[PDB]
Design a protein around this ligand. Sequence first.
Ligand SMILES: Nc1ncnc2c1ncn2[C@@H]1O[C@H](CSCC[C@H](N)C(=O)O)[C@@H](O)[C@H]1O
Ligand SMILES: [Co+2]
Ligand SMILES: [Co+2]
Ligand SMILES: [Co+2]
Lengths: 8, 245
Amino acid sequence: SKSKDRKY
Amino acid sequence: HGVCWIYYPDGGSLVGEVNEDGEMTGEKIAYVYPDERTALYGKFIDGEMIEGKLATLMSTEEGRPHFELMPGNSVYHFDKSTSSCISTNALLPDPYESERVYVAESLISSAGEGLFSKVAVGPNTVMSFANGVRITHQEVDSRDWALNGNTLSLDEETVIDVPEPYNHVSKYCASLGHKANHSFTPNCIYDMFVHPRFGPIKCIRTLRAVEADEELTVAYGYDHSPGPEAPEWYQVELKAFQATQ
Ligand SMILES: Nc1ncnc2c1ncn2[C@@H]1O[C@H](CSCC[C@H](N)C(=O)O)[C@@H](O)[C@H]1O
Ligand SMILES: [Co+2]
Ligand SMILES: [Co+2]
Ligand SMILES: [Co+2]
């Protein structure tokens, strides 16, 4: 994703 | 005749005499920030802030908080962002954040402005709030990195963004967490936060003690192997970081 701090 | 305190996991709380349904509804309800001293005190309906005035929690007696109102006519209300509106008072700063952080030129080369501590604090201290408009992962992912400099995932459905021109402090300073720069050796982390004005957002929380005027940084946490799906400045920094390792 092109956003910070995503839970992968 | 009793007083109830309801703590969120982030350490903020609602406090007051609840009504017969057990709800936080009244003219003397308060939200108390995680310092257990800064408060927004006034009219709430079922825990939603209708009119909270800035106050200090001076003491507690038998569990009951005793507040002193701060001077000025500083009032706040629940004002959760939408996909297109960031705040009904974009230039009205959060009073807790304003005592703890300020924005200046970053110490990181070529990184623009950054977020700095105003005072020395201990570990685990909430310093700043990351509020923004609320958009979908589909919108963000389907578009250019040039437009994604400020996007922060909130959960599996929502991304928080601070779009132009709100990335300038002269146009938006209600919250300042979008001003923290990236570091692979950060002094802070993003954490969930339930804010009485902003609603469900994230905050910047320290991992360790920080001194006054120290730059606050967080790990942006882009996916490193979806190479990395990330801006080039980060990809460069990742390689350097991996090298020193
Ligand atoms: N470690 C780093 N190195 C270089 N640029 C960085 C960085 N961390 C953040 N940035 C910059 O900051 C942006 C994210 S928002 C962070 C605040 C920004 N510096 C500002 O002045 O408003 C990124 O798009 C990038 O331009
Ligand atoms: Co107003
Ligand atoms: Co400006
Ligand atoms: Co780049």
